[PDB]
Design an enzyme around this catalytic site. Structure first.
Site, PDB file in Angstrom:
ATOM      1  N   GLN A  21       0.810  -1.223   0.000  1.00  0.00           N
ATOM      2  CA  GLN A  21       0.000   0.000   0.000  1.00  0.00           C
ATOM      3  C   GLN A  21       0.844   1.274   0.000  1.00  0.00           C
ATOM      4  O   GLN A  21       0.349   2.360  -0.328  1.00  0.00           O
ATOM      5  CB  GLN A  21      -0.959   0.011   1.193  1.00  0.00           C
ATOM      6  CG  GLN A  21      -0.277  -0.012   2.558  1.00  0.00           C
ATOM      7  CD  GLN A  21      -1.264  -0.266   3.687  1.00  0.00           C
ATOM      8  OE1 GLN A  21      -1.637  -1.406   3.952  1.00  0.00           O
ATOM      9  NE2 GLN A  21      -1.697   0.796   4.348  1.00  0.00           N
ATOM     10  N   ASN A  58       0.093  -9.445   5.056  1.00  0.00           N
ATOM     11  CA  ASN A  58       0.098  -7.997   5.197  1.00  0.00           C
ATOM     12  C   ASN A  58       0.279  -7.372   3.799  1.00  0.00           C
ATOM     13  O   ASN A  58       0.632  -8.063   2.844  1.00  0.00           O
ATOM     14  CB  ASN A  58       1.256  -7.601   6.128  1.00  0.00           C
ATOM     15  CG  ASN A  58       1.002  -6.315   6.882  1.00  0.00           C
ATOM     16  OD1 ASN A  58       0.125  -5.528   6.538  1.00  0.00           O
ATOM     17  ND2 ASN A  58       1.777  -6.092   7.916  1.00  0.00           N
ATOM     18  N   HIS A  77      -5.493  -1.216  11.639  1.00  0.00           N
ATOM     19  CA  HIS A  77      -5.007  -1.835  10.414  1.00  0.00           C
ATOM     20  C   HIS A  77      -5.828  -3.075  10.091  1.00  0.00           C
ATOM     21  O   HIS A  77      -6.228  -3.801  10.984  1.00  0.00           O
ATOM     22  CB  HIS A  77      -3.535  -2.209  10.658  1.00  0.00           C
ATOM     23  CG  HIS A  77      -2.805  -2.761   9.466  1.00  0.00           C
ATOM     24  ND1 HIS A  77      -2.741  -2.111   8.250  1.00  0.00           N
ATOM     25  CD2 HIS A  77      -2.045  -3.876   9.331  1.00  0.00           C
ATOM     26  CE1 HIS A  77      -1.976  -2.803   7.419  1.00  0.00           C
ATOM     27  NE2 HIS A  77      -1.541  -3.878   8.052  1.00  0.00           N
TER      28      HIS A  77
HETATM   29 HG   LIG Z   1      -4.942   1.380   7.226  1.00  0.00          HG
END
Ligand SMILES: [Hg+2]
Ligand SMILES: [Hg+2]
Ligand SMILES: [Hg+2]
Ligand SMILES: [Hg+2]
Ligand SMILES: [Hg+2]
Ligand SMILES: [Hg+2]
Ligand SMILES: [Hg+2]
Ligand SMILES: [Hg+2]
Lengths: 452, 227, 452
Positions: free
Chosen positions: C66, C391, C368
């Site tokens: 990300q 992740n 998260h």
């Molecule tokens: Hg986030």
């Protein structure tokens, strides 16, 4: 019993793990280097002090760097002398040629080795002495007497005429290896020829000359023989602090006295070896570099006198060459030399072994030579607390190349200083100028006989 | 036929001998268990090797107590009592008493396995202190003496105490069972329950009684044994 | 008393310094980060275990990243779905467009904000709600319901047609800042116009349209509007694992069902909020992105059921979207999530505060969203020990992008999972399909209402 019992160690483990300090210790010690983990900043906060009330007026400019070589002793010895030139010629920066001395020192040791083999030809190849001679015949390290041996025969020269340009001055490992491999071949060849003939023999004499020649041939491939011979004139143009140009014509030997102000006849090295009585002379058997040069001899003195000789010398505006055990209790990042800088007692690690025994038991010896350029006496009525040390590892090591050493470190992990005989008390100077003084003779492999 | 997977790294330690000896053996496990990658614990052997050498040193000092401190032998014993290096016979000495274990249960996690210089230095400094203490006590008494015996035990204990600060004693004792779950090349999960000593024979296929080391020392006659 | 007394603290100091554990602790803690110093390798040795007996057959290829954005929720939600495409189309590597959803999510939140300001125009500018609306109107984070809101209106598309090319997808801070600065200007302008007029007013209506337009104008400067509209056809050529070329013509909305296998009507998010009774529905007031979209509602369930729902789901070969408190008790280097990985008790640091109170006292919340792709039940007759986590921080984070989370971590620092209603026990599913269920309504600023 005398063997490791598995039940015993697991039982001890069980007991240690129940202690909270041990639990924390194993946790941290499995993560970082003990010195990094145990560095005590509370202590560092007080010990990292750079105020010195007694300092040498001239500044060590620039900070020198021996790089990958064991030439500290030459750097330190010349660092002490450079200050005279710097001062007498009003120069901003100045350096004597360390490489000059390095070239001759290595040539002489290779030659000296050959003689050592010849003189021990009667001993077995596997004897302690012969194996020792064969271990590191061309190592970079040396002693002050060995420093003077070279200055007497070769003089001194400004670095501007001969510097650290060659690869081998700053990375001598390979060069030494190539030389030593040859010398070990020569060692065999000499001994073999010595079984049938005598050293005085024309044949042996011829043999040694051809070895000397190959030794010089090989050394000249890695470094050039200095540009001028010891009694040969050189011209050196320079600029003083005032942007004024000057020219000096001298000889390596004249320059050493005339400009560097060295009278080889005055320095004596005092040692602090607790295994022997003080006031006694200690001589290291066979230790040398120049065949025929002087022998390494130390006057064994107590730390109380030694501390004073250093203060007086500093007060007389002269730097003090000293030898100690690097990097014992030395923090290279800060430049602090303090035996209490790391919190080992917090992990219960304590060392009661005395200095004399440390030396005796293969734990401490001189390994590096540096320069004391200042000190700080307790401003009241007490004594020296710390000393200012100039290292030859570049200006990034320590604090801009400089270190600070505690008095206690000086007493414990430092074993030698160099002073001029005229600075000694009559009682001590005499030991050098008398005759009764038969020196305590130590073998070549004795820890005080281990160079710098 | 079997490929050395993965390539090992001793880092800043002189544990080559243990890596090489175990590298020879890992190939058997890799093969017999159809594993893509596999390693025996080098650290396991390293822990015991260092503990044993510190202990062994003490005995060497005791047995040479009659010689001068500056003799060639005593100075030699004092030079590098805990050095990482070793020989194959010394490798077998450890496997016989301690067996072998998969690296998955005990690896190179501690700082000291990959940067042993400091650890060795701290240990050696102590041992040199102990060396003096033993010899001194040996001037007045005999080794069989209750006092000396007590003295050596307290040294052994401090030696273990200090080593346990830098590395943990292996998780299982030589005859103690351990369970090891793994995945074969076929993504299939397996579990093995064994003991360090059994695992060495059973899985690593080592019969300590068979290897001999041949040397090529031209200074001595061949066909001769060198000790 | 209530004030800090200087004598008192120096007396306490004196007492703490006499404890050997404290002495070692201060020495090490002044040198390294507590987590680095206290990392327990004895524990790591056992906990860093990558063997999982229950895993999702398809492999997460490739590991996503990300970068500098809070788009985890979109990555995790799409990471769960990519596995269906990867599998159904026999692809070696595959990714759905995270940027696609990101573009629409940000546009919608800016628009949604305007409405929120209009609906709270009667409240003072300094009220808790208005100040909250003004805090982070365009933040990247979101919830699963908000994820479905977008998929329902916009569908899904392969990353090959629209990826992370723009600077702002991987470094969204500036973009958000520029947008938010404008929105805060708009907020004032709307409220001012709302003092004199009604929202239904032609003038207000016109005003909001010009704001919407400027919002789109500004967003199109940093990212392009996706290439196809939700019901518009796109052609996608690809190569399967067999080096065979294929072409698919679909629409974003059709592709989502047809290839990504998402039926927006099935996923429900279960939460573990100990401050409220289980079996109860929890709704976050005002939380959303798409004006008119669905509201965030969670079914509050115990960890025992939750653990089982995860095992069953994994056994049904599906990955599990979950939300937790990153990076609490997370070692990014190893990828281990274990609340006992660091030896804090060795320094006497202990935390008895319960989960519910942690949430209540501003200490723990979801921050998260990640993906559970495997787990490991104690091979005998016990229960799950650890979980395999994927992740979206690149393949270098953790162990090749993957993490391992303990059951205990799951119980303590994880607050949500997403399952399909058909996977729930009748007793639980009903809470969603009944009517009696009036949800416990929490404010927008409640820690469970804090996105991911
Ligand atoms: Hg986030
Ligand atoms: Hg040196
Ligand atoms: Hg002084
Ligand atoms: Hg002084
Ligand atoms: Hg000294
Ligand atoms: Hg499981
Ligand atoms: Hg599970
Ligand atoms: Hg959870």
């Amino acid at each position: 019993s005398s063997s490791i019992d598995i039940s015993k160690i697991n039982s001890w483990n069980k007991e240690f793990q129940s202690d909270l300090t041990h639990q924390l210790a194993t946790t941290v010690l499995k993560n970082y280097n003990a010195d990094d983990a145990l560095l005590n900043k509370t202590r560092l906060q007080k010990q990292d002090n750079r105020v010195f009330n007694t300092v040498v007026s001239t500044d060590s400019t620039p900070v020198t760097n021996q790089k990958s070589s064991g030439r500290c002793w030459l750097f330190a010895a010349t660092n002490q002398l450079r200050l005279n030139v710097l001062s007498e010629l009003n120069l901003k920066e100045f350096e004597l040629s360390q490489a000059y001395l390095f070239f001759y020192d290595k040539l002489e040791k290779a030659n000296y080795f050959l003689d050592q083999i010849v003189s021990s030809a009667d001993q077995d190849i596997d004897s302690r002495l012969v194996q020792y001679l064969l271990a590191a015949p061309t190592e970079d390290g040396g002693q002050y007497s060995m420093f003077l041996n070279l200055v007497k025969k070769y003089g001194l020269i400004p670095k501007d005429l001969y510097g650290d340009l060659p690869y081998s001055t700053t990375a001598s490992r390979k060069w030494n290896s190539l030389l030593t491999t040859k010398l070990r071949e020569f060692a065999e060849t000499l001994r073999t020829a010595l079984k049938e003939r005598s050293a005085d023999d024309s044949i042996i004499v011829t043999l040694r000359e051809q070895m000397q020649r190959e030794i010089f041939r090989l050394m000249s491939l890695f470094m050039d023989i200095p540009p001028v011979q010891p009694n040969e004139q050189f011209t050196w143009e320079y600029v003083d602090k005032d942007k004024k140009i000057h020219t000096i014509k001298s000889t390596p030997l004249e320059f050493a006295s005339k400009y560097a102000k060295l009278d080889p006849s005055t320095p004596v090295s005092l040692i602090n070896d607790p295994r022997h009585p003080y006031g006694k002379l200690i001589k290291i058997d066979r230790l040398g570099n120049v065949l025929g040069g002087d022998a390494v001899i130390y006057l064994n003195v107590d730390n109380e006198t030694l501390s004073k000789l250093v203060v007086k010398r500093l007060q007389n505006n002269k730097a003090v060459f000293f030898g100690s055990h690097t990097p014992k209790f030395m923090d290279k990042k800060t430049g602090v030399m303090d035996i209490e800088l790391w919190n080992y007692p917090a992990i219960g690690y304590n060392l009661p072994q005395q200095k004399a025994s440390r030396i005796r038991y293969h734990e401490s010896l001189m390994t590096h030579a540096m320069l004391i350029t200042g000190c700080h006496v307790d401003e009241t009525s007490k004594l020296p607390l710390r000393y200012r040390v100039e290292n030859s590892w570049g200006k990034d090591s320590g604090k801009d190349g400089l270190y600070v050493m505690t008095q206690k470190y000086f007493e414990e992990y430092c074993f030698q200083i160099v002073v001029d005989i005229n600075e000694l008390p009559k009682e001590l100077a005499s030991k050098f100028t008398s005759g009764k003084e038969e020196p305590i003779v130590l073998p070549i492999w004795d820890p005080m006989g281990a160079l710098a």
